[PDB]
């Protein structure tokens, strides 16, 4: 009778789903939407294709349903975070969004780092660069012609992405805190818009959303766009969202989104904790309680198994990859440390080269698949390892097409000493903003009942011994050593 | 009119070739024998088997060459060195061979090599290994029954696989310097059996051969056995025979036999020079003058291709390495230092295992294929750079398989910094037994007669610049540090 429709506005897909409150899909809809390349290094999105991507998501996912958009009981909304937008008191834009893999500001926040970098960090959770939306937002009112004195006076809104479907679809000018906190102007600890980084960053208040929680109506949609009047009652950045659809809901509860690269988070609940080698963000805002997190990434996971199939093409798909290394009882020495574009946390060599070490005459297409899956594990437990210091880690809830793989899965758990869980739903982006919005309308009663009703496809219990944990880990710290400055020799 | 018959009665096939004056074959025979493994690391011949195999060969040689008996001048022979062989009076064999391959003797000769094992190199140029003939003949006194008593009167005959031909064919108990020095027996600089060694391996001086000039007649075949009275007039081990084959006449001449591993041999004329890094051996006796050589060898450059195409199976045959290489311009950052057991010298290091670094997204099949054949090249030049250190080298002289590929023969000019001299003739060590022989009856006037006839195919010139040639090679050693000391740590 009554459905949950979430919104996940990717950053090369628009998605659409409708829930009910055993989390079951009645309907979906999904639209790619064009990547625009301008110079090199620059990545832009045109809002427009956006959002007609995701309008039609929509309507695909109510006529795959079966319902009257009536039957709406609210919408949730989530979104590719810092990615950068500015429109007119219409809603139409005022330049094409600056995507959050744009580098156009690389050597903008180099600049500002060593004057002003361990302030950001405190204030906000972030490493300053150019992934986050400050210097983003700053080089669109210092180079768009008009822009800056149209701000100067109020006809200029600033957004993220989820800020600029909530508008469109409401009226109303609103951010959670979760996508907030992604943006480097906000402070994290206070929950407010940083006034010293509004002023390093020369960006007039004008501009600025108001931030709300992550559960809450922030607004109704307009009959004549879905043809009713329903609530936008949840609001969060995807991964955060992610982590909420996986119930992560307490501190130590892991999720890894596997994909061309990663994405790791963990619940903190309410404690901020600071790493050297990892993002400190907000979680989400539910009812007057805020939950952090700390989040690392990898750039290279997926893509090594790509690079098996396209660079030295020893397979055709991705999923043979399962059957090579499952016919090896162990790696037989043989290690893959795919650092195409150098080593992130805890190493931090830009110069570190993909190596593959342990070849011997009877080295085959098992070992080079093997070790590329247990390499996904391995830099998998170097981001874990990191947030262990920091807070106790309970478990992995993981998401993304490789969690198919059951023995890259049971590796995981293996390696980790955790067990690894992989849910039924599979759009956990989605699937958490679908439990944000509900909340807010009691779709859902709470968060409990959230969790009770949760359902795992399958769970990796953890059967390796530490002595093989330890060995195994050991051989790959060793060659990660091996791979270390590889192209300052080159 | 008149031509020589060759026999090369190599590890693994006995081969048969007639040459004329201008070193053109006229008849080729080649037959494959067993190889018997009774146990794991133990290596073994029939002489009944090599000696079938060898017979055929020289009658399919005679037969394809459309000659008869007595227009062969002459006989030499060439071998695969080390190998062991007891015989009685009427030819018959008292055993197996022990094949130079045979690692029985490790623990024979490892507790030896502590007391005994710097004079050896001394006496003989060898570092004392299961390798040389002196501990597989002690072997077969210790183990065969009844074979010491025998022994102990003169009833049992000892020789390389030479001396067995020899034998078989004339009757007469004889072997050269060449093969004689890798006994382990033989003293080097005194030119005779050394007594403390006989001693030391419990050898009856009854058992050892005469020990002859490469170039003299030793005897004559029996009118029955190939239907003439043909002189047998040279012998040497088969790389020695390849060295002169080679026309390799004066010191700082290289012969680099490219195979599943290689032989790299430079003439050092009069001089005996002494290496921690490469044997002391003895090239030939000619003219009543003994020529010296130093020998360095690879167990892993042609079976690096072979794992290519079929370990990783990334491509069909080992010519497309060629093809796959000059697509590139450089190794762009990418190394393989295919250290399947280790790296020999001079890095000595057992615990090395085979690399691949520079990995990145685009790294391809081509990148494999080249940094293989570079790979060859750099493990050649690290042998050939230790020979540097004793003697000048003139040029490479090149011979096997892999010297087909242009790419290869090129870069290992570049990377030398030398002129790489591939022959038209490339069964080089039967050409260089024809060549003693020929030389005991005048076939040819002397070996400045040899030397104006001998023909190269192509002569590689080195086109690289000093600066780019030390930069290839930096790389190349910082790729080796990163192999070694691999299987300590899995």
Redesign the interface.
């Given at each position: 009778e009554k459905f949950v429709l979430s919104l996940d506005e990717g950053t090369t897909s628009a998605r659409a789903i409708i829930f009910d409150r055993e989390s079951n899909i009645h309907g979906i809809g999904q639209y790619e939407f064009p990547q625009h390349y301008p110079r090199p290094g620059w990545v832009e999105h045109n809002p427009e294709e956006i959002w007609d991507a995701q309008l039609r998501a929509i309507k695909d996912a109510i006529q795959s349903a079966r319902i009257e958009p009536n039957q709406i009981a609210a919408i949730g909304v989530t979104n590719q975070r810092e990615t950068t937008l500015v429109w007119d008191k219409d809603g139409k834009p005022l330049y094409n969004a600056i995507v959050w893999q744009c580098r156009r500001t690389a050597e903008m926040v180099e600049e500002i780092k060593r004057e002003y970098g361990t302030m950001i960090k405190e204030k906000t959770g972030l490493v300053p660069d150019a992934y986050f939306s400050a210097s983003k937002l700053k080089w669109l009112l210092d180079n768009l012609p008009g822009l800056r004195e149209k701000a100067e006076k109020g006809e200029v809104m600033f957004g993220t992405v989820d800020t600029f479907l909530i508008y469109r679809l409401t009226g109303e000018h609103v951010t959670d805190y979760s996508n907030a906190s992604r943006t480097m102007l906000f402070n994290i600890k206070k929950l407010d818009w940083d006034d010293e980084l509004l002023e390093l960053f020369d960006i007039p208040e004008s501009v600025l959303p108001e931030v709300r929680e992550s559960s809450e109506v922030y607004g109704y949609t307009k009959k004549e766009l879905l043809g009713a009047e329903i609530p936008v009652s949840g609001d969060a950045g995807d991964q955060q969202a992610a982590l909420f659809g996986e119930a992560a809901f307490e501190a130590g509860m892991v999720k890894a989104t596997y994909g061309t690269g990663s994405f790791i988070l963990v619940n903190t609940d309410e404690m901020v904790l600071y790493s050297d080698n990892l993002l400190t963000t907000i979680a989400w805002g539910l009812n007057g309680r805020v939950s952090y997190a700390l989040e690392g990434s990898i750039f290279?996971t997926g893509?090594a198994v790509?690079?098996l199939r396209d660079?030295?093409?020893?397979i055709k798909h991705a999923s043979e990859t399962e059957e090579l290394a499952t016919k090896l009882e162990s790696?037989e020495?043989v290690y893959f440390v795919?650092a195409?574009?150098g080593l992130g946390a805890p190493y931090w060599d830009q110069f570190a080269?993909?190596?593959?070490?342990?070849?011997?005459?009877?080295?085959?297409?098992e070992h080079?698949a093997r070790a590329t899956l247990e390499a996904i594990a391995y830099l998998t437990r170097d981001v874990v390892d990191e947030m262990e210091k920091l807070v106790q880690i309970k478990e992995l809830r993981v998401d993304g097409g490789a969690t198919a793989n059951d023995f890259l899965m049971q590796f995981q758990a293996d390696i980790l000493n955790r067990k690894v869980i992989r849910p039924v739903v599979k759009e956990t982006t989605a699937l958490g903003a679908a439990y944000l919005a509900g909340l807010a309308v009691d779709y859902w009663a709470d968060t409990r009942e959230i969790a009770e009703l949760w359902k795992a496809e399958r769970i990796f219990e953890p059967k390796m011994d530490e002595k093989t944990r330890e060995?195994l880990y050991?051989?790959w710290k060793?060659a990660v050593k091996?791979?270390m400055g590889?192209?300052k020799?080159?």
């Open positions: 290279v893509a790509q690079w660079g030295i093409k020893i790696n020495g795919p195409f574009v080269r993909g190596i593959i070490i342990g070849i011997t005459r009877g080295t085959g297409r080079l060995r050991k051989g060793e091996r791979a590889w192209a020799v080159v």
